[model samples]
Target: VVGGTEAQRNSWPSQISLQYRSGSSWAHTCGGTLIRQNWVMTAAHCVDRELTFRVVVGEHNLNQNNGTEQYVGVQKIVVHPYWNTDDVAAGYDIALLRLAQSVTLNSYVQLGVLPRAGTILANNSPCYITGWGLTRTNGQLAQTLQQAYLPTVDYAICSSSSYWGSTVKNSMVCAGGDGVRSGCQGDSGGPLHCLVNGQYAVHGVTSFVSRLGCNVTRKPTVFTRVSAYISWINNVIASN
Candidate 1:
């Protein structure tokens, strides 16, 4: 994440590293939220390509052995039915992954609480975007999890011509348009934690950044509004 600071090891317990096999090694490709012991929520674009994927929970440092990490293979993936890989800007960029095995919950690994269906944050609501994404445009991914304060940019304002315009759909959430801080490459599928009623909930699944740049002015980071898909998520979980 651009203009972000290293997050405390267990600050965001639900944060996870979604990695894909790269030859003999596993490489971090995106971030995801642990919604259940065996389920993860992420951006559909993160799993668009067919590859061997695994999730590392309780992970903080990418290159360090923290001893708290739990690795599990992705057994099944369910992308939003309406998701279109060629048009992420049109929304529907959400996905759910069923883990091969249920992970143990501890201080460093726990389920993320999602917002209620149809819940929407007020303009400029406080939120944080955490991930192992790049620190700048075209930069390397961070060695540790980083978080930036990306206040919500209400749909009304985010859809203005000066902002994301018609590309910003109501099914999406926009944040951090100040251009100094935002989600970047490798951050996709991460959680956007927003404070509501004194509790933090997973309100968004990091989806995309501006095509112009990661931290472009008036082009805040966009995410799949998690609250808008509560039923879809529950149905997927129940049926699976």
Candidate 2:
């Protein structure tokens, strides 16, 4: 996150670290949301490479053992059929990774709930983006997890010429383009949790940011709207 504070441990139980093997060590490449004990939601681009991937649930610090972490190898990767690696602007940037085995749920790890299909939050709705992404544009990965309050920017305003322009779509959510705080490189595939009707649900999957910079003045971090793909997600899980 461009401007964020250290997230309290267990504050975002569904958040996860997506990593790839690099020689003898695994490097954190992206963040994800644990939607099920054996399933994780992430950006298709995060797994574009053919490297071995793993999911680490209940992780807080990348450089330290948090005791509650559960490591699992990915058994299956299901990228959206319509996803185009070169055309993230077209949407359909989501993906799912099935763990080799189901993890035990606890205060530090749990499933993420999805909002009802086609549910869209009102403008400026309260939400938070959590991840272990870079603290600034072109920066290194953060050692500890961080979170920023990123209010919703409705599609109308986000797609305006001065904002995201033609790149913004109805299938996406835009937030935190305030030039102070925003999602950075490593945050892709993470969740945007929004509270509604007295409960919080996973509303977005981190998708993209401005080419100019992560914390650009008018370029809010864009995310694949989870509500738009509720049916698709359900079908994939059921069919698998």
Candidate 3:
């Protein structure tokens, strides 16, 4: 959230803070979406490291408790089989975490609705990326959640040499090349909520940004296309 505003408490009910236990304290490492009572959707790279992780729902400020947070332990992590940490440009950067117990839902915390299988939004679709990531490249994480308007950058335009070149793929959704509002460190695994047919849906899982900086012109934020993996997600939830 290089250039964004503080998010309202209920603006993104499915949003969550993914934390990792470090010594005697916990650190916010990434963001996630609660997809089920006991499952969360996030980036595969977030869980690549062997660390004790937990999901905190209804969290607005990472450093302070809002008295509405629900902390839960992760029982299992299921990363995309084709995910390769060394080659994020190849896609398949999504993952799902099963919680040790089902979480109780409320107004502040709810399940995120995902798009239908193979669904694709038209170019320049309205969307927003929310997280507690850094406000600038290499900067510290925000004390509160933040959100930025990041419209969709269709595959054709995003894959063009002028934009992300061949690095962009159909399995990914590119958004916010404004060079102002963009996702930075600690924002990975967050949700890209896109407005479609008068309703908002989780269309992407925050994956990566340009190496040049967090906010780079012509290099919109990249995300794992959620619509491209509906079948895979359903299968995992059902089997697990």
Highest-scoring model, TM-score: 1
Q: Native-vs-model 2 lDDT?
A: 0.93
Question: Which candidate gets the maximum lDDT versus the true structure?
Answer: 1
lDDT score for residue 77 of model 1: 100
Winner by TM-score between candidate 2 and candidate 1: 1
Candidate 3: tens digits of C-alpha lDDT, residues 26-88? 999999999999999999999999999999999998888879999999999999999999999
RMSD of each: 0.5, 0.7, 0.7
> Distance from true position, residue 200, model 1, in Å?
0.6
Candidate 1 regions with alpha-carbon error over 4 angstroms: none
lDDT of 1 by residue, 148-168 (tens): 999999999999999989999
Instruction: Give the whole-model CA lDDT for all candidates, comma-separated.
Output: 0.96, 0.93, 0.94
Q: Residue 95 lDDT in model 1?
A: 96
Q: Each candidate: how many clashes? A: 0, 0, 0
Worst lDDT 10-window in candidate 1:
208-217
| Candidate 3 Cα misplacement greater than 4 A, ranges | none
- 130 in model 2: Cα distance from truth in Å? 0.6
Sorted on lDDT, best first, the list reads 1, 3, 2
The TM-score that candidate 3 achieves is 0.99
Which residue segments of model 2 deviate by more than 4 Å?
Answer: none
